[PDB]
Design a protein around this ligand. Structure first.
Ligand SMILES: O=c1cc(O)n([C@@H]2O[C@H](COP(=O)(O)O)[C@@H](O)[C@H]2O)c(=O)[nH]1
Ligand SMILES: O=c1cc(O)n([C@@H]2O[C@H](COP(=O)(O)O)[C@@H](O)[C@H]2O)c(=O)[nH]1
Ligand SMILES: [Cl-]
Lengths: 222, 218
């Protein structure tokens, strides 16, 4: 029982104006039913952008808010985000168990889902996050987290994350394309890949998405 | 940065009418408001300009920025476009992610505050062990503004030691989370206070009371 992500491909819609974001998302609609909306778009166009995407595309919405505050503020953020119509929210694990639990409690109450971000894809992740990541992931499992985010750019780390969370957990992975991660290699471990710039900055986003999907065709579910 | 009464209001009410009313009630006591995601996600980024129009306060956007460098740049740009004077950024994601924020702040005439250790009990699990190194990274990157926890004065003092007396340090966890205003101001330039003021029966009296308790420190 996990979200059914069409073509194992999630669009990271980080364009910052409504017109372009709507155009590109519409162009790739036949390939992707799950869109990750983050703060670049939300802070530029408002939380109503979630409403507009639901109206226009009917896509599933993951709010990539990397929630990273104290328990009381995390609760408020999750409440506001689910109220606006997000299906799921992404939460940092590094602030600790209480901060994560606050998000899980709201998701449970409100009938939505939390994704736990355990390690990140940027080079700077090696400084502090990488050393804590196995324990952050183990903490997530202990807390009952079922959905996780881990980095395409570090296949050995993504593999270990998959081991810790088990085969039944749901794992999505960014860093594919622009940051250097390979779609097929990433799907060895992740249930779905997240792709932003490779698609949304392409002259033909639909062709870019179709091309990624063609490259992973033998990895799709019947 | 010159914060009136060394007191920053954490305005985490989630509706515009209450947030504006309560801020107005305490306006004589403050000139600096921290606005975070509870208010922004409920009422929109336009709330920042509205606070400036009504109160002419400085605005710190407490967005705990914690993404990759490319996304951090976008978040900072959108935030400063909305009129924030400063933004709070996590150090835990590493130097590149912090640098991305420093760059946009310089471009738009704003400040970055580096959050190095957090105030909640869970901060002990992963953040605390990294916090001194995160602070040293801030120093190496030229960060001048920092955030550290009222709930652990010995850790707040250590942060002040690392960054030096010339850096600017603000500190949440005062009141509701158990931190003491006067003790916190031994180390921090200003205290951040949310619930003790905004959930008080009488927010103005609450703010006035806090200020009375630290009057010899002003
Ligand atoms: O470790 C992580 C976690 C993320 O959410 N992301 C997010 O995934 C997306 C990556 O987009 P892109 O394909 O353009 O690199 C961005 O929205 C980014 O904020 C990431 O790149 N690395
Ligand atoms: O370590 C930290 C960092 C924060 O920004 N904060 C923020 O400071 C404020 C504290 O509010 P309060 O006084 O109601 O506890 C909240 O907005 C919270 O998100 C915190 O409590 N601890
Ligand atoms: Cl690796």
């Amino acid at each position: 029982d996990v979200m059914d992500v069409m073509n194992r491909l999630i669009l990271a819609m980080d364009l910052m104006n409504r017109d372009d974001a709507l155009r590109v998302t519409g162009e790739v609609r036949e390939y992707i039913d799950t869109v990750k909306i983050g703060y670049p778009l939300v802070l530029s166009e408002g939380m109503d952008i979630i409403a507009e995407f639901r109206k226009r595309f009917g896509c599933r919405i993951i709010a990539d808010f990397k929630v990273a505050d104290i328990p009381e503020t995390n609760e408020k953020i999750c409440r506001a985000t689910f109220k606006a119509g997000a299906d799921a929210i992404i939460v940092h694990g590094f602030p600790g168990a209480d901060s994560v639990r606050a998000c899980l409690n709201v998701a449970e109450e409100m009938g939505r889902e939390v994704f736990l971000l355990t390690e990140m894809s940027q080079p700077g992740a090696e400084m502090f996050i990488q050393g804590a990541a196995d324990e952050i992931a183990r903490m997530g499992v202990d807390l009952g987290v079922k959905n996780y985010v881990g980095p395409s750019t570090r296949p050995e780390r993504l593999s270990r994350l998959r081991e810790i969370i088990g085969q039944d957990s749901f794992l999505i992975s960014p860093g594919v394309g622009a940051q250097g991660g390979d779609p097929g290699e990433t799907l060895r471990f992740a249930d779905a890949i997240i792709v932003g710039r490779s698609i949304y900055l392409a002259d033909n986003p639909a062709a870019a998405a179709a091309g990624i999907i063609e490259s992973i065709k033998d990895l799709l579910n019947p």
